[PDB]
Design a protein around this ligand. Structure first.
Ligand SMILES: Fc1ccc2c(c1)[nH]c1ncnc(N3CCO[C@@H](c4nnn[nH]4)C3)c12
Length: 167
């Protein structure tokens, strides 16, 4: 038993809800919140900008120190950093950005990072300003992640289409 509330159960291990990940994170304090990161951990907009703003820019300060030491992530890769006031940990995961021409096949590799964590609150990778089809992203998530994933979908209209077209 865990503290996630109001989710619709899609499969044995995937759950979905219409929620603002920032507000869901502040209420659950999950062990892991996933950020839709870029390779530079520049958290300017989308989910990343919203998560970082919620931390009062502490996420960005920590991220800049990480990059200065380690260099950029790989597309499809991840790193674990602090969850600040939102979660124990933040798993920064880089899905391919279609608006940069990155291969969408890397979306499966991105979701594989979730399997290193027993339970996660997460957005749909490569959705939103990353330009991929959120329905494809949900399909890859379901077919790749084996651990327990609670997906937060900000847009109510999108969620309803996601739930309604799910196979
Ligand atoms: F201010 C915001 C902006 C975006 C989100 C937010 C608060 N909260 C969210 N909770 C879940 N999913 C989200 N998004 C929505 C747009 O499409 C995807 C994306 N994520 N990053 N770029 N695009 C996923 C958001």
């Amino acid at each position: 038993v865990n503290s996630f509330s109001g989710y619709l159960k899609l499969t044995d291990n995937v759950y979905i809800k219409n929620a603002d990940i920032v507000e869901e994170a502040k209420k659950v304090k999950p062990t892991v919140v996933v950020n839709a990161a870029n390779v530079y951990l520049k958290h300017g907009g989308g989910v990343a900008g919203a998560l970082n703003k919620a931390t009062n820019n502490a996420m960005q300060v920590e991220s800049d120190d990480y990059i200065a030491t380690n260099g950029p992530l790989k597309v499809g890769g991840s790193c674990v950093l602090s969850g600040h006031n939102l979660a124990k940990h933040c798993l920064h995961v880089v899905g391919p950005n279609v608006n940069k021409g990155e291969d969408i096949q890397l979306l499966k590799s991105a979701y594989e990072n979730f399997n290193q964590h027993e339970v996660l609150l997460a957005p749909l990778l490569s959705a939103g300003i990353f330009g991929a089809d959120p329905i494809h992203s949900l399909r890859v998530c379901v077919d790749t992640v084996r651990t327990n994933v609670y997906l937060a979908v900000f847009d109510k209209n999108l969620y309803d289409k996601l739930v309604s077209s799910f196979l």
